[PDB]
Amino acid sequence: GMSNKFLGTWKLVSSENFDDYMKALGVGLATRKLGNLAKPTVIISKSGDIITIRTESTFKNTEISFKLGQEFEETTADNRKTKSIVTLQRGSLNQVQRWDGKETTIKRKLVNGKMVAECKMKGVVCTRIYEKV
């Protein structure tokens, strides 16, 4: 199952290439200007087979709850209405989002007590690092 080590409250400590990633997502300038300044808190909890990922920033909050491998409807921070699925591959929590024939991936894994989120969209690769708070 998903590592309990994922469970808890995390906070952004580093972001590489987030602007280009958002740009690839078609994000608007207003949301980009703020997304580049934002240092979100990610809270991850799990109950039975139900997992929740909550994102909090002074600018925008998001929350998704899901079961591994079961596609669900998601509304992203940038107001994308996507069909999403989260899977587990070698202890890496992998989210795929599909919309308008397009596709993006967010892979979250633990690295020396840190959580690393790699965001991919059309050759643009973003790395956001979180610390456990």
Ligand X SMILES: CCCCCCCCCCCCCCCC(=O)O
Interface residues toward ligand X, by CB under 6 A? 22, 25, 27, 31, 35, 38, 40, 42, 55, 57, 60, 62, 76-78, 106, 117, 119, 128
Cβ-Cβ contacts under 8 Å for 124 (sequence gap 6 or more): 17, 20, 21, 23, 24
Partner from Cl ion, ligand X, none contacting 58, C-beta within 5 to 8 A by type: Cl ion
Residue 105 lies near Cl ion (rule: CB under 5 A): no
Partner from ligand X, Cl ion, none contacting 42, C-beta within 5 to 8 A by type: ligand X
Task: Using CB positions, name the residue nearest to ligand X.
Answer: 35
Is 32 marked as a binding-site residue?
no
Q: What are the DSSP calls for 29-50, one per residue?
A: HHHHHHHTT---EEEEEEETTE
Which of 73, 54, 71 is closest to 63 using CA atoms?
Answer: 54
Residue bearing tokens 């956001």: 128
- As to burial, measured by CB atoms within 10 angstroms (0-12 exposed, 13-18 middle, 19+ buried), residue 121 is buried
Number of neighbouring beta carbons within 10 Å of residue 124:
17
Residue 45 lies near Cl ion (rule: CB under 5 A): no
Residue with smaller CB distance to Cl ion, 39 or 83: 39
Is 130 marked as a binding-site residue?
yes
Residue 38 lies near Cl ion (rule: CB under 5 A): yes
Site for Cl ion in 49-88 (CB under 5 A): 57-58
| Torsion, Cα of 41, 45, 50, 56 (10° steps) | -20
Least distance in Å: CB of 1 to ligand X?
21
Binding site feature residues for (9Z)-octadecenoate: 108, 128-130
